[PDB]
Design a protein around this nucleic acid. Structure first.
Ligand SMILES: [Zn+2]
Lengths: 100, 217, 49, 206, 87, 129, 123
RNA sequence: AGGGGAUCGAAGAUGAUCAGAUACCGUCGUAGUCUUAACCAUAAACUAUGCCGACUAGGGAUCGGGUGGUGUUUUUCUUAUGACCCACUCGGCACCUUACGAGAAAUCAAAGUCUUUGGGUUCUGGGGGGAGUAUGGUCGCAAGGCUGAAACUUAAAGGAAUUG
């Protein structure tokens, strides 16, 4: 296998070997640069209702907060559906994110 | 049958450009096969080798025949052409056509004072292709051609009498050996000397003067 | 690019001594100097026997 | 040298500044590139006027030198310049190409749209990149109506222009079509505006 | 390009580029011929007279064809107050 | 560190002529560079050049011609014994017709044709052609 | 799945390009003009040329089409582009006052020419 | 060899799966993980690219200073610092686009300025295996490091790319 990428695991540059971090699914050790960091905001009540709780409740307005869970995925685990999906040769080069 | 396409094709059929210089001086393209046949009478037209080459198929393989051919005379013109047809003898017909289109001049000299006519290269030239570098390197009178038999035929057609060589690389690949040497021999006109420093008047081309006769009215 | 090797006017010593080391990585030089032809090679380092 | 007459018409200075020819060239800057006269506040540059009108006359002198007229090609893929090129072809002999170029036009003698010209005139080097790059294969000169954004790959005699849109494309071809006819053609005197009209070029309603 | 006493040996005494003073080769497809008309008094143009230049394909691909033309034109007297010496 | 001032001068000239320039700025400057350039000036390889005097060391600016091809240096200044000039002139130059191998000696700084007339030789500096 | 073939559209372009006259709307009259000029062997292929040629006549009354527009269609533009609906007035003279140029553009006039109309804006 | 000893955890116990499973999955689990005095000196210790010096091509971001802008705000009034903006400049981590150059090619503004070969200098390599083994030194409490062969075997082992 020759040279695949230029940056590789990415951001370790002008810098020595760095701290790792555990994955969510597998509980596997992986570098924090080579991590795949999705940030998943969720409504604390599930949107299939959502009225049914607020109809019977006390108070007006209602805060109805959101959980702020930051996630990490050890590359091979992320290829199961997560933010990867294998690309072509020249399609690899696009660092701009899809959508938005 | 004849029937020309393009402006230079019609110009030669009238009979204004002699043989040849006015094409090479002004850097005019020569896409038609019939131009060099009309201008130059003497042409050989000698085959080097024939390689069967395979492309893979789901049930078998595709035999296709490459054909290397050299072109020249015995004054100062040489050419090279490669083509890959599936017919063996038909590829030689295709190879001779393409080599005539890319015929290219040569600049000769001395070699140790003038006295008589020139019969070797002027300056030390070289050319590269893949990883095969060729180097030449004039000689004196009566030394002969000192090169591989494949390279020797290319120099004989040029009209060069005496020359040394120093090939370096994987020289058994006969396509890259000749194609590298074709750059070295073609790079003679290009290197400046004390003779060519004197300034010349920039001449009008054949296309500029004979505009009305060419083009389909 | 200085091509690694010392290109000095008084480099003489290092140029000679560097090559007597690198000469040992050749089979014909190594077998001539050490002389395994006499000590091995069933014959006595000869043509016929 | 020059006739000591074409010294930039003072009436024609009104036509240029009204059409917004010398009021842009964007913030971005390719660095040839001396066709400027200081920077305006809030990210806008200023093109010099005397340098443009000199080079349009220089471009006309090259076009006048060719003997056979039906030869010089005008090219435009950008939809603004399509109307302007068709007018230039009608006045003086010059086979136009509107929209797509069709690759292998100058090269490849089988094609139906097979040109073999001795001069190419281009509106935009950005959109007509196929026209300029492929013309180098058979020794053809180029003329480009560029601004300070576009590149200079095989670009000879670049008239400084404004390629934001609309007006300056129509005006620069109008001045070209005049100056080609002034030197060998219809007009026996440079004076009298001549009409015709600049607005006969320009972009129309769809 | 010479021999003993009689005549000049060689053919194709090649064209040099006006900008760089570099030899233009035969197969260098990219090289160009800029022919510019000779003007007379009060408009006009003299038929069959040009101020010819020649540029190599090397500098034309680089991007300095336009800048080199204005340098040549201003010295010959085909322009006025365009190309500056100091910058 | 800039061990050879002469090597830095002729290196800067080659990169300029390759790109297609008509002017080069050589900073470090020396007597030997000025002696070397004046031999090139006689034989038509270089036009005019002018020495800017910083009150310190020196600074040269050159006008290129469009004639040069390569201007090389040979840093270990090897000793030459008149008859052994045939080795150096054959290798470094193309052909026997023309070219120059600029060498230094007790007379001055000559080219190989100039040194042949006097029956004189010494160390070597560089070459042209 | 009644996608018409290439060989039908070979004739449909070639017939309508030259013979724009002798083509008016309906099937039956235009069907008699297909076998007129051309020499088709079969009935099925002959009548299938009449189908797609007649369909292009329905669209031709609702604007033009790419690739199929010749003889009359280039001329049927055409004055509209040649003698344009504009121009009333010049236009684009100094109708709206007298040049609303910038500060830097006003200073640019002094070096080259002399004096033009100027309603100078401060930017 | 001391202290500490929560969590996870080689050995090891111990449930399932399996044709066998002393392997992956699970429940516990000694040493170890932390530190204090000693040792050991190796990793894909990888940008798989030795340092010092020139010269060659554009393009914006960014981290640190240093300059100038009747620029914008902060507002305690001009403030005066600060914090933002516009242009410029040295040093640094990096990127983008083109190759005219280079390369076996993937690719590279250095892997460029090399048959037109020479700026100064240290180190390592010469078909594949046997082998980082034998033997002798030398260093460590050990584990093992550093140094480092041959007899004898064989015509290929390998790098990058194209079809299937
Ligand atoms: Zn995971």
């Amino acid at each position: 296998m020759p040279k695949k990428r230029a940056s590789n695991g990415r951001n370790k540059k002008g810098r020595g070997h760095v701290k790792p971090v555990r994955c969510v699914n597998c509980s596997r050790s992986v570098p924090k640069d080579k991590a795949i960091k999705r940030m998943a905001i969720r409504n604390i009540v599930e949107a299939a209702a959502i009225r049914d709780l607020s109809e019977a409740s006390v108070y007006a307005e209602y805060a109805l907060p959101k959980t702020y869970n930051k996630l990490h995925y050890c590359i091979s685990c992320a290829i199961h559906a997560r933010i990867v999906r294998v690309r072509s040769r020249t399609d690899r080069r696009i660092r701009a994110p899809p959508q938005r | 049958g004849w029937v020309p396409v393009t402006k230079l094709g019609r110009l030669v059929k009238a009979g204004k450009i002699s043989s040849i210089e006015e094409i090479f001086l002004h850097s005019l393209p020569v896409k038609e096969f019939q131009i060099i046949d009309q201008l130059l009478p003497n042409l050989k037209d000698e085959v080097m080798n024939i390689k069967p080459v395979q492309k893979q198929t789901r049930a078998g393989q595709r035999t296709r025949f490459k054909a290397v051919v050299v072109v020249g005379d015995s004054n100062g013109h040489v050419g090279l052409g490669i083509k890959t047809a599936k017919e063996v003898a038909g590829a030689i017909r295709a190879g001779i056509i393409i080599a005539k289109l890319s015929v290219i001049p040569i600049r000769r000299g001395y070699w140790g004072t003038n006295l008589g006519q020139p019969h070797s290269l002027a300056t030390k030239t070289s050319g590269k292709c893949g990883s095969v570098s060729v180097r030449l390197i004039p000689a004196p009178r009566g030394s002969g051609i000192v090169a591989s038999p494949a390279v020797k035929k290319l120099m004989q057609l040029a009209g060069v009498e005496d020359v040394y060589t120093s090939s370096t690389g994987s020289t058994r690949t006969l396509e890259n050996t000749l194609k590298a040497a074709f750059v070295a021999i073609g790079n003679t006109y290009g290197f400046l000397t004390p003779n060519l420093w004197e300034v010349q008047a920039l001449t009008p081309s054949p296309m500029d003067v004979y505009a009305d006769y060419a083009t389909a009215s | 690019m200085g091509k690694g090797k010392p290109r000095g006017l008084n480099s003489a010593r290092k140029l000679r001594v560097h090559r007597r080391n690198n000469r040992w990585a050749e089979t014909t030089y190594k077998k001539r100097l050490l002389g395994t032809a006499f000590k091995s090679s069933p014959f006595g380092g000869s043509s016929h026997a | 040298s020059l006739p000591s007459t074409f010294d930039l018409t003072s009436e024609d200075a009104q036509l240029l500044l009204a059409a917004r020819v010398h009021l842009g060239a964007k913030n971005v800057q390719v660095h040839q590139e001396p066709y400027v006269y200081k920077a305006r506040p809030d990210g806008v540059n200023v093109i010099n006027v005397g340098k443009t009108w000199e080079k349009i006359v220089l471009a006309a002198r090259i076009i006048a030198a060719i003997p056979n007229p039906e030869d010089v090609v005008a090219i435009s893929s950008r939809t603004y310049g399509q109307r302007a090129v068709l007018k230039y072809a009608a006045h003086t002999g010059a086979t136009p190409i509107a929209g797509r170029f069709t690759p292998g036009s100058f090269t490849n003698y089988i094609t139906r749209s097979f040109k073999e010209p001795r001069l190419v005139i281009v509106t935009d080097p950005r959109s007509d990149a196929q026209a300029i790059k492929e013309s180098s294969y058979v020794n053809i000169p180029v003329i480009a109506l560029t601004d300070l954004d576009s590149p200079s790959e095989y670009v000879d005699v670049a008239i400084p222009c404004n390629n934001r849109g609309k007006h300056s494309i129509g005006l620069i071809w109008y001045l070209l079509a005049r100056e080609v006819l002034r030197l060998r053609g219809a007009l026996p005197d440079r004076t009298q505006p001549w009409a015709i009209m600049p607005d006969l070029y320009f972009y129309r309603n769809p | 390009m010479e021999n003993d006493k009689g005549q000049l040996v060689e053919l194709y005494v090649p064209r040099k580029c006006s900008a760089t003073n570099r030899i233009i080769k035969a197969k260098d497809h990219s090289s160009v011929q800029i022919n510019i008309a000779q003007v007379d008094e009060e408009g006009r143009a003299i038929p069959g007279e040009y101020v010819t230049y020649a540029l190599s394909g090397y500098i034309r691909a680089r991007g300095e064809a336009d800048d080199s033309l204005n340098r040549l034109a201003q010295q010959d007297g085909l322009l006025k107050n365009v190309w500056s010496y100091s910058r | 560190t800039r061990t050879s001032v002469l090597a830095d001068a002729l290196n800067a000239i080659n990169n300029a002529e390759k790109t297609g320039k008509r002017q080069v700025l050589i900073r470090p400057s020396s007597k030997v560079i000025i002696k070397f350039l004046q031999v090139m000036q006689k034989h038509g390889y270089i036009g005019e050049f002018e020495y800017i005097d910083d009150h310190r060391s020196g600074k040269i600016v050159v006008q290129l011609n469009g004639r040069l091809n390569k201007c090389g240096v040979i840093s270990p200044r090897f000793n030459v014994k008149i008859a052994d000039v045939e080795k150096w002139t054959a290798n470094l130059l193309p052909a026997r017709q023309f070219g120059y191998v600029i060498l230094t000696t007790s007379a001055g700084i000559m080219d190989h044709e100039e040194a042949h007339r006097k029956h004189v030789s010494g160390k070597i500096l560089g070459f042209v052609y | 799945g009644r996608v018409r073939t290439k060989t039908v559209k070979r004739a449909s372009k070639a017939l309508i390009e030259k013979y724009y006259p002798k083509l008016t709307m309906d099937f039956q009259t235009n069907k008699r003009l297909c076998d007129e000029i051309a020499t088709i062997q079969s009935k099925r292929l002959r009548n299938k040329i009449a189908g797609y040629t007649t369909h292009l006549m329905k669209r031709i009354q609702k604007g033009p089409v790419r690739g199929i527009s010749f003889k009359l269609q280039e001329e049927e533009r055409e004055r509209k582009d040649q003698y344009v609906p504009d121009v009333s007035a010049l236009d684009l003279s100094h109708s709206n006052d007298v040049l609303n140029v910038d500060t830097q553009t006003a200073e640019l006039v002094n070096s080259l020419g002399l004096k033009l109309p100027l309603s100078v804006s401060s930017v």
